[PDB]
Amino acid sequence: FNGSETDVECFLGRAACVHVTEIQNKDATGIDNHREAKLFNDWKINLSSLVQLRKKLELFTYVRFDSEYTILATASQPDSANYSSNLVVQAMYVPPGAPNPKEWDDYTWQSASNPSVFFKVGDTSRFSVPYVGLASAYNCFYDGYSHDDAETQYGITVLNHMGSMAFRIVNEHDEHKTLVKIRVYHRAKHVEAWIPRAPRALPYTSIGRTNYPKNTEPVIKKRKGDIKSY
Amino acid sequence: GPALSSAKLILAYTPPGARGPQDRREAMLGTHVVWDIGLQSTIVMTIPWTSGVQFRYTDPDTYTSAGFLSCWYQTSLILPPETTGQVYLLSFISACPDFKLRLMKDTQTISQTVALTE
Amino acid sequence: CGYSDRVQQITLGNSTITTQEAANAVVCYAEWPEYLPDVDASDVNKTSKPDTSVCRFYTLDSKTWTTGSKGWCWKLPDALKDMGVFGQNMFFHSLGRSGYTVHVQCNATKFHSGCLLVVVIPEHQLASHEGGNVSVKYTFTHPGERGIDLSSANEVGGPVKDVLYNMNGTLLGNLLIFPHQFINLRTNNTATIVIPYINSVPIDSMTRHNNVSLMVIPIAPLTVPTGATPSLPITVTIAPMCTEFSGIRSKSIVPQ
Amino acid sequence: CGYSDRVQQITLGNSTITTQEAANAVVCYAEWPEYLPDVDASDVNKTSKPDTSVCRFYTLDSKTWTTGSKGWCWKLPDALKDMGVFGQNMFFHSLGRSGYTVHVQCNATKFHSGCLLVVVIPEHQLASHEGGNVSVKYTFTHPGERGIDLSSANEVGGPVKDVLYNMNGTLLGNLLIFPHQFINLRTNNTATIVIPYINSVPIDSMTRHNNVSLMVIPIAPLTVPTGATPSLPITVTIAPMCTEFSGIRSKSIVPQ
Instruction: State the DSSP string of D66-107.
Output: ESS---EEEEHHHHSSSSHHHHHHHHHSSEEEEEEEEEEEE-
| D interface test, pick of B49, B50, B69, B100 with most D CB neighbours within 10 Å | B50
Nearest to D14 among C13, C14, C249 (CB): C249
- Give the closest residue to A131 by CA, choosing from A44, A191, A59: A191
D247 backbone dihedrals φ, ψ, rounded to 5°? -70, 70
Q: What is the DSSP pairing of strand C231-238 with strand A89-94?
A: unpaired
Largest CA distance in chain C: 68
Element containing residue C91 per DSSP (H, E): helix C84-92
- The CA distance from B37 to B69, in Å, is 19
Nearest to C249 among D13, D249, D252 (CB): D13
Residues ≥6 apart with Cβ < 8 Å to D166? D172, D175, D215, D217
- The CA distance from C242 to C47, in Å, is 13
Searching chain C, which residue's CA lies closest to the CA of residue D15? C249
Per CB-CB distance under 8 Å, the chain C contacts of D13 are 249
User: What Å distances lie between residue D58 and A83, A195, D55, D122, D247, CA to CA?
Assistant: 80, 48, 9, 20, 23
The number of CA neighbours under 13 Å toward the Cβ of C22 is: 15
- Given a contact cutoff of 8 angstroms between Cβ atoms, the answer to whether B26 and D253 are in contact is yes
- The CA distance from A57 to A51, in Å, is 8
- The CA distance from D150 to C87, in Å, is 44
- Give the closest residue to C175 by CA, choosing from C42, C52, C71: C71
- Given a contact cutoff of 8 angstroms between Cβ atoms, the answer to whether D58 and D16 are in contact is no
- The CA distance from D12 to A147, in Å, is 33
- Give the closest residue to A61 by CA, choosing from A177, A197, A200, A229: A197
Neighbours of C252 (CB within 10 A): 8
Judged by DSSP in three states, A109 sits in helix
Distance of CA C13 to the CA centre of its chain: 20
Q: How far is A128 from chain C (nearest CA, A)?
A: 23
- Give the closest residue to A170 by CA, choosing from A88, A114, A50: A88
Residues ≥6 apart with Cβ < 8 Å to D125? D168
Q: How far is C79 from chain B (nearest CA, A)?
A: 15
- Given a contact cutoff of 8 angstroms between Cβ atoms, the answer to whether C210 and C55 are in contact is no
- The CA distance from A93 to A42, in Å, is 10
CA distance from start to end of chain B: 50
- Given a contact cutoff of 8 angstroms between Cβ atoms, the answer to whether D207 and D91 are in contact is yes
Chains linked to D by 3 or more Cβ pairs within 8 Å: B, C
Judged by DSSP in three states, A124 sits in strand
Q: CB distance D253–B31 less than 8 Å?
A: no
- Given a contact cutoff of 8 angstroms between Cβ atoms, the answer to whether C70 and C152 are in contact is yes
| Interface present between B and C (3 or more CB pairs within 8 Å) | yes
Q: CB distance A205–C198 less than 8 Å?
A: no
- The CA distance from D85 to B47, in Å, is 29
Neighbours of A106 (CB within 10 A): 15
- The CA distance from A43 to A144, in Å, is 25
- Give the closest residue to A70 by CA, choosing from A127, A121, A153, A133: A127
Q: CB distance C233–B78 less than 8 Å?
A: yes
Q: For residue C12, what is the DSSP state?
A: B
Q: How far is C142 from chain D (nearest CA, A)?
A: 25
Judged by DSSP in three states, C88 sits in helix
Q: CB distance B39–C229 less than 8 Å?
A: no
Per CB-CB distance under 8 Å, the chain C contacts of A135 are 200-201
- The CA distance from D86 to D76, in Å, is 12
- The CA distance from A17 to C164, in Å, is 33
- The CA distance from A145 to C50, in Å, is 27
| Interface present between B and D (3 or more CB pairs within 8 Å) | yes
Q: What is the DSSP pairing of strand D190-195 with strand D95-106?
A: antiparallel
- The CA distance from D72 to D74, in Å, is 7
Per CB-CB distance under 8 Å, the chain A contacts of C130 are 211
- Given a contact cutoff of 8 angstroms between Cβ atoms, the answer to whether D63 and D231 are in contact is no
Q: For residue A101, what is the DSSP state?
A: P
Neighbours of A212 (CB within 10 A): 25
The arrangement of strands across the sheet holding D72-75 comes to D72-75, D212-223, D113-122, D180-184
Judged by DSSP in three states, D57 sits in coil
Nearest to A202 among C169, C198, C211 (CB): C169
CA angle D250, C235, B24 (to 5 degrees): 40
Residue type, D250: S
Q: CB distance B26–D253 less than 8 Å?
A: yes
Nearest to C107 among B6, B28, B33 (CB): B6
CB pairs < 8 Å spanning C and D: 6
- Give the closest residue to D76 by CA, choosing from D171, D10, D148, D174: D148
| B interface test, pick of D97, D199, D245, D250 with most B CB neighbours within 10 Å | D250
CA distance from start to end of chain D: 55
- The CA distance from D186 to C58, in Å, is 61
- Given a contact cutoff of 8 angstroms between Cβ atoms, the answer to whether B5 and B77 are in contact is yes
Searching chain B, which residue's CA lies closest to the CA of residue C16? B33
- Given a contact cutoff of 8 angstroms between Cβ atoms, the answer to whether A218 and A82 are in contact is no
Searching chain D, which residue's CA lies closest to the CA of residue B14? D250
Q: For residue A192, what is the DSSP state?
A: E
Nearest to B29 among C16, C19, C84 (CB): C84
CA angle A61, A149, C122 (to 5 degrees): 20
- Give the closest residue to C80 by CA, choosing from C47, C104, C54, C48: C54
DSSP characters over chain B: --TT-BB-EEEEEE-TTSPPPSSHHHHHHTEEE---BTT------------SBSB---SS---S-S-EEEEEESS--BPPTT--S-----------TT----------SS--------
- The CA distance from A151 to C145, in Å, is 26
Q: What is the CA radius of gyration of chain A?
A: 21
- The CA distance from C196 to A62, in Å, is 16
| Interface present between A and D (3 or more CB pairs within 8 Å) | no
- Given a contact cutoff of 8 angstroms between Cβ atoms, the answer to whether A48 and A60 are in contact is no
Q: What is the DSSP pairing of strand A40-42 with strand C113-122?
A: unpaired
How buried is D117 (Cβ within 10 angstroms: 0-12 exposed, 13-18 middle, 19+ buried)?
Answer: buried
Q: Which of residues 11-70 of C touch D (CB under 8 A)?
A: 13-14
Chain C within 8 Å of A62 (Cβ-Cβ)? yes
Per CB-CB distance under 8 Å, the chain A contacts of C210 are 143-144
Residues ≥6 apart with Cβ < 8 Å to C172? C163, C164, C166, C217, C219
Q: CB distance B7–C107 less than 8 Å?
A: yes
Searching chain D, which residue's CA lies closest to the CA of residue B30? D252
- The CA distance from C85 to C54, in Å, is 7
Backbone CA torsion sign across B100, B106, B110, B114? positive
Per CB-CB distance under 8 Å, the chain C contacts of B42 are none
Q: CB distance D251–B18 less than 8 Å?
A: yes
DSSP characters over C24-87: --EESSS------SSS-SSS-------GGGT---EE---EEEESS---EEEEHHHHSSSSHHHH
Stated resolution in angstroms: 3.8
Q: CB distance B26–D252 less than 8 Å?
A: yes
Q: CB distance B78–C232 less than 8 Å?
A: yes
The arrangement of strands across the sheet holding C113-122 comes to C72-75, C212-223, C113-122, C180-184
Method by which this entry was solved:
cryo-EM
CA distance from start to end of chain A: 36
Buried b or exposed e, range A168-201, using 16+ CB within 10 angstroms: bbeeeeeeeebebebbbbbbbeebebebebbebb
Nearest to B15 among D205, D247, D253 (CB): D247
Q: CB distance B29–C14 less than 8 Å?
A: yes
Buried b or exposed e, range D135-154, using 16+ CB within 10 angstroms: bbeeebbbebbebbbbbeee
- Given a contact cutoff of 8 angstroms between Cβ atoms, the answer to whether D209 and D121 are in contact is no
Nearest to A139 among C135, C174, C200 (CB): C200
Q: Which chain B residues touch D if contact means CB-CB below 8 Å?
A: 14-15, 17-19, 21, 26, 29-31, 50-54
Q: CB distance C133–A205 less than 8 Å?
A: yes
Q: Which chain C residues touch A if contact means CB-CB below 8 Å?
A: 75, 122-128, 130-135, 138, 160, 162, 164-165, 168-171, 174-175, 177-178, 198, 200-202, 207-211, 213
Residues ≥6 apart with Cβ < 8 Å to B43? B11, B33, B35
CA distance from start to end of chain C: 55
Q: For residue D51, what is the DSSP state?
A: G
Q: CB distance A142–C174 less than 8 Å?
A: no
- The CA distance from C109 to C113, in Å, is 9
Per CB-CB distance under 8 Å, the chain B contacts of C18 are 34-35
Q: How far is D68 from chain C (nearest CA, A)?
A: 37
Q: CB distance B31–C16 less than 8 Å?
A: yes
- Given a contact cutoff of 8 angstroms between Cβ atoms, the answer to whether D73 and D214 are in contact is yes
Distance of CA A161 to the CA centre of its chain: 12
- Give the closest residue to B21 by CA, choosing from C13, D252, C85, C82: D252
Judged by DSSP in three states, C174 sits in coil
Per CB-CB distance under 8 Å, the chain B contacts of C227 are 81-82
- Give the closest residue to B48 by CA, choosing from B24, B31, B61, B71: B31
Neighbours of D83 (CB within 10 A): 14
- The CA distance from C207 to A148, in Å, is 8
| B interface test, pick of C6, C58, C107 with most B CB neighbours within 10 Å | C107
